[PDB]
């Protein structure tokens, strides 16, 4: 994400534009709620059941 942002800045993007060019899909991988080592043995069900259904 930082590499993409820096390439955007260096091409003359504003900060708003640089960060707005990051795909939501890429940003969502950089969130610990998607890390498989954050769960619990008896915390049953889908990841959606903990933090929620991600919207945006």
């Amino acid at each position: 994400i930082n590499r993409r942002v820096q390439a955007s800045l260096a091409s003359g993007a504003t900060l708003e534009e640089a960060w707005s060019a990051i795909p939501e899909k890429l940003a969502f991988y950089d969130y610990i709620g998607n890390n498989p080592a954050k769960g619990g043995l008896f915390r049953t069900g889908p990841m959606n059941k903990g933090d929620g259904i991600a919207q945006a």
């Binding site: 709620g33 903990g50 933090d51 929620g52």
Partner: protein, 245 residues
């Protein structure tokens, strides 16, 4: 009486009782208004704690009901001292300065609900009627006092949250929405007023000692803003020794 020592008293329950005066003490203690006075010891011994029931309707007569003390003989206020002013209208005003002027108390309502309260007379200012040329068994004091939060600012809840210390969130629910938990997460420090009457029933005019009954009203614990307090009525007996200052 055989002036009691600590070893006479220890473990009897006498340590939580106020001194008493016997039936001969129906005298009058003279007040010389050029003289300054003090209360050298004020003692308040609660004998009943009533809690105001919280009814559904609204509007109805909500009554104060009896309760059971569960915190044992740990309830009395004592060793309280302060100024006793003589005012221009001949009334007296007691200004509490210091002493053991609070006790935490838990009483239990029928059904099991526990009601903790900071039973107190902190910062009491209480006055008589005008024209008290002598303190007699007609004298009474009425006043108000401060009632601070039952827990002070460092107190941490069972999940480690506090006002002056602790976590500021529900750390066991890391991605919970915070709005529903605000009242639990954000600790608040209550400061309210209580009211007390002291009715003098007995006076030793030679020694300046008085005793009688009291009734106080104040709010109970609100658990640092987590729930509404209850109204509490405290009834008991008191003792005070008056001295020229």
């Amino acid at each position: 009486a055989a002036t009691l020592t600590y070893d006479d008293i220890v473990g009897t329950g006498l340590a939580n009782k106020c001194p008493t005066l016997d039936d001969t003490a129906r005298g009058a203690y003279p007040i010389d208004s050029s003289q300054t006075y003090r209360i050298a010891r004020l003692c308040l011994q609660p004998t009943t704690f009533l809690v105001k029931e919280e009814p559904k309707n609204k509007r109805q007569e909500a009554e104060f009901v009896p309760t059971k003390l569960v915190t044992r003989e740990t309830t009395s206020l004592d060793q309280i001292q302060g100024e006793l002013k003589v005012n221009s209208d001949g009334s007296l005003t007691f200004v509490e300065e210091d002493g053991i002027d609070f006790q935490p108390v838990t009483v239990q309502m029928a059904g099991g609900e526990r009601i903790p309260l900071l039973f107190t007379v902190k910062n009491l200012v209480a006055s008589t009627q005008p024209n008290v040329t002598s303190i007699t068994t007609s004298t009474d004091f009425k006043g108000e006092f401060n009632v601070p939060s039952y827990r002070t600012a460092n107190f941490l809840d069972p999940k480690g949250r506090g006002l002056a210390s602790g976590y500021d969130s529900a750390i066991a629910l890391p991605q919970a929405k915070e709005e529903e938990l605000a009242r639990a997460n954000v600790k608040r420090f209550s400061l309210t007023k209580g009211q007390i009457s002291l009715n003098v029933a007995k006076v030793d005019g030679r020694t300046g000692e008085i005793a009688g009954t009291f009734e106080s009203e104040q709010l109970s614990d609100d658990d640092m803003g987590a729930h509404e307090p209850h109204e509490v009525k405290i009834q008991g007996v008191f003792y005070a020794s008056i001295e020229p200052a």
